[PDB]
Amino acid sequence: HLTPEEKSAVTALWGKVNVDEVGGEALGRLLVVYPWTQRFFESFGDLSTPDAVMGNPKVKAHGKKVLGAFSDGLAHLDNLKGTFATLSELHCDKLHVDPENFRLLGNVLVCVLAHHFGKEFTPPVQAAYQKVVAGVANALAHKYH
Amino acid sequence: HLTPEEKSAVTALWGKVNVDEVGGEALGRLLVVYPWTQRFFESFGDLSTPDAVMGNPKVKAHGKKVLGAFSDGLAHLDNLKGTFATLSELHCDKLHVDPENFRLLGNVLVCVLAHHFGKEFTPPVQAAYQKVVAGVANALAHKYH
Amino acid sequence: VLSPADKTNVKAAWGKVGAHAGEYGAEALERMFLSFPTTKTYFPHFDLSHGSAQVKGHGKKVADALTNAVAHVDDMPNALSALSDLHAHKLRVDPVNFKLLSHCLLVTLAAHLPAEFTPAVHASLDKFLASVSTVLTSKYR
Amino acid sequence: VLSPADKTNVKAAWGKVGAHAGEYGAEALERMFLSFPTTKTYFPHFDLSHGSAQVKGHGKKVADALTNAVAHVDDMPNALSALSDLHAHKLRVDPVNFKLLSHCLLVTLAAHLPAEFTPAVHASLDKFLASVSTVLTSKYR
Ligand code: HEM
Ligand code: HEM
Ligand code: HEM
Ligand code: HEM
Ligand SMILES: O=C(CSc1nnc(-c2c[nH]c3ccccc23)o1)Nc1ccc(C(=O)O)cc1
Ligand SMILES: O=C(CSc1nnc(-c2c[nH]c3ccccc23)o1)Nc1ccc(C(=O)O)cc1
After folding, report:
1. In this complex, do A50 and D112 lie within 8 Å of one another by their Cβ atoms?
2. Which of A58, A138, C114, D136 could form a disulfide linkage to A44, CB 3.0–4.6 angstroms apart?
3. Which domains, from first to last, does chain C contain?
4. Which residues does the annotation say bind heme b (chains A, B)?
5. Is D20 annotated as belonging to a binding site?
6. How far is B141 from chain A, CA to nearest CA, in Å?
7. In chain C, which residue ranges form alpha helices assigned H by DSSP?
């Protein structure tokens, strides 16, 4: 669980996140670094190269929704399973996403935060964010459990 | 979530499973096939060769307990998570076993049943057992969820 | 990465499979489709019923790729280059599916090789299928 | 398995790290111990406090090993064989831990090299770290 001081450091950094960029950068990096994930997103059009992925407006728009779900998680850290229940049904029952991929996206988001925040993304701040993304990944996978 | 026909198939095969040996065979094969798992069993003595592992009396005795746990799950298919609560806390909270290793041991066990049962271990009988070993592994990993 | 002993074991075990390689490839696929039904989403055209000619045919192609990998164990990226392109670049198969098929191939070998599926052979074959899987899930050309 | 572009990307990115290699290795270890405390089970007798000289010295060793792996990307089983001995044969490190360290190394690089840590470079470094991890977790001699 996040301690009070962890929750504080998390919310302070999250307040500074560029809401139009960070989500699409995380989703884009997922598709580039773990290319099998592109099979779920073929309908988004051209994902044929790193630059195509990162310049794809559907990736950018979808990434903004993903970021919004993370924001929703951050506002409900004591009830992630309830917050993500319908999303879990989508991702597990309908899409059959392997749950490892939820963990991969969480870790890519952590990489994007480090990228944006540099030295401000300290090891303790990272540790707090790892609890967050682990909780979100677990909540998404709830319908497999 | 096994069909009634899957339940009778699972039950019929399990009634022929030798309680003294199949668990030891599965644990032994885990230690041989996936050598990092040996780190959890330093107190068992000589694991230097496949023959040392498969003849090791502590592997056999421990494997009997592992097999007894599977027997327990089979008797409580509608509540694997409760059946395995105490073991989940041991494996996750105390030993910090990576949950993928739970899946590996379940799959080794399936390989052991196949070896023993040959033609009887048909694809549909495997499919039923796969639901069982997935449910056991998921239950053992509950304390990470 | 395979040891000398692993390579010996794999060549010996696959030798024991011999002319049944295609049959075993097909059975492994059948086991996979029944156990892990989401894998069927990769073969929707196919008749996936028990005794299917399409599964029989595919199983032979899989088996022949494995025979090729065994014969070129020290040259796998080269030997499997077109299969890597297909699985990693064109089809984008989720690597988890390779774990599923590899498991089902081991189960199939265990069921058919009661006298030869020793713990060491098991170990070596598991490593071999991980090595194959790694090549087929990598884009390296 | 790395493409030519992956090899180029890795050599270029690690070349940029240069003299920071040990500092960044130590930072990655610290990130790992704080984020994933179960990893401290491998270092039970170490001082793992912030600023630890032992973590600094270990970070340098890890970093130098990576430099060697980058130089010998096409000869890694040979180049890294003593480290395979150490990690696979002696310590028997569970492979999941390699994912965790690899992740922490990527975070470290992202935090320090914003211009160099492009999606392509991130992808190539992830594959390289997977290849290193596979050698270090395999018993092949
Ligand atoms: C782990 C954190 C993740 C979060 C928080 C997340 C969140 C979301 C959200 C908010 C939506 C939109 C739902 C809607 O419009 O009603 C969605 C859709 C989707 N997600 Fe995820 N997701 C995650 C992981 C993944 C992963 C790993 C994959 C695939 C590899 C994936 C594939 C999809 C797909 C295919 C859709 C439908 C997109 C479309 O075509 O419009 N998601 N996700
Ligand atoms: C997936 C199925 C597994 C089952 C059903 C299972 C079952 C059990 C049982 C019944 C016990 C004995 C509990 C007692 O005596 O109170 C036990 C202990 C233990 N298990 Fe497992 N286990 C599983 C997987 C694993 C794996 C994958 C590992 C490690 C890689 C592991 C490591 C251990 C250890 C170290 C102990 C304690 C041994 C001792 O100190 O004597 N288990 N397990
Ligand atoms: C040991 C692992 C594997 C081997 C050796 C293997 C080998 C092959 C071969 C030889 C082909 C035929 C290529 C041709 O006709 O030119 C093929 C096609 C294919 N493979 Fe695999 N494969 C493996 C794993 C997988 C997995 C895990 C999946 C998905 C679950 C998969 C999905 C397919 C699909 C969809 C095709 C194309 C089928 C078609 O168009 O007929 N393969 N594979
Ligand atoms: C990129 C991956 C890795 C590389 C390149 C690497 C490299 C090294 C090197 C060079 C040493 C020798 C240190 C010396 O001589 O002082 C070493 C030792 C060690 N490594 Fe790793 N390592 C890696 C991953 C891991 C992981 C994932 C773990 C466990 C979480 C681990 C645990 C250890 C331990 C416990 C030692 C011995 C430390 C001591 O007691 O002095 N390594 N590693
Ligand atoms: O085992 C094989 C062929 S099958 C296979 N599986 N993984 C690899 C592999 C080769 N280079 C890699 C780089 C990083 C990750 C894995 C690999 O190869 N080759 C092989 C075995 C032993 C040695 C030696 O003792 O020096 C050299 C070569
Ligand atoms: O990428 C590297 C060096 S780093 C690495 N990672 N995995 C392997 C690897 C080598 N042989 C294996 C056998 C089975 C599983 C994996 C491996 O190697 N070598 C490499 C790259 C491309 C080719 C080609 O285009 O023919 C050949 C070789």
Report:
1. no
2. A58
3. 1-141 (1.10.490.10)
4. 62, 91
5. no
6. 9
7. 4-17, 21-35, 53-71, 76-79, 81-84, 96-112, 119-136
